[PDB]
Design a protein around this ligand. Structure first.
Ligand SMILES: [Cl-]
Ligand SMILES: [Cl-]
Ligand SMILES: [Cl-]
Ligand SMILES: [Cl-]
Lengths: 89, 86
């Protein structure tokens, strides 16, 4: 595996989770649902796991999906700390 | 929203390798692309990260790298949570 394939994929996944699906995430991220849906499916295929429950009425993550998200949320918090060290200037 | 997170990873490699040439080799990228990304990065940040007087990083550039390093570690931890499951 390569943890450095595309860091934006981890960003999008954590945001779709945080905002309960592609409807809010598209407007939170200023991106189309089509791109967000494709990247998350391609991220699942690279990781070789099932992060998302395709059977639920609403968006829902698997047990593995919840662990992966919390790691994604940590990475995002660091990237915001990087930007916040600049916003002090 | 946030911008391209891969640039913070590119920046850390430029710093740890001490120049665009070395970082471009291990990343599999041309120097032009690598230089294009950091130029856009310094511009949107509004601060100078790398010194141009002599390779050397600026004071705020070193502070910014410290967070990029932590960001990469958490990205590595995320993949490990998958590799452990598989
Ligand atoms: Cl890695
Ligand atoms: Cl939705
Ligand atoms: Cl940002
Ligand atoms: Cl480019």
């Amino acid at each position: 595996s390569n943890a450095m394939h595309d860091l934006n994929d981890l960003y999008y996944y954590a945001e779709v989770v945080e905002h309960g699906g592609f409807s809010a995430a598209a407007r939170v991220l200023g991106l189309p649902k089509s791109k967000l849906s494709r990247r998350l499916a391609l991220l699942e295929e690279r990781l070789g796991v099932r992060l998302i429950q395709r059977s639920t009425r609403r968006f829902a993550v698997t047990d593995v999906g919840r662990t992966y998200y919390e790691h994604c949320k940590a990475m995002i918090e660091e990237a915001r700390a990087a930007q916040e060290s600049i916003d002090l200037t």
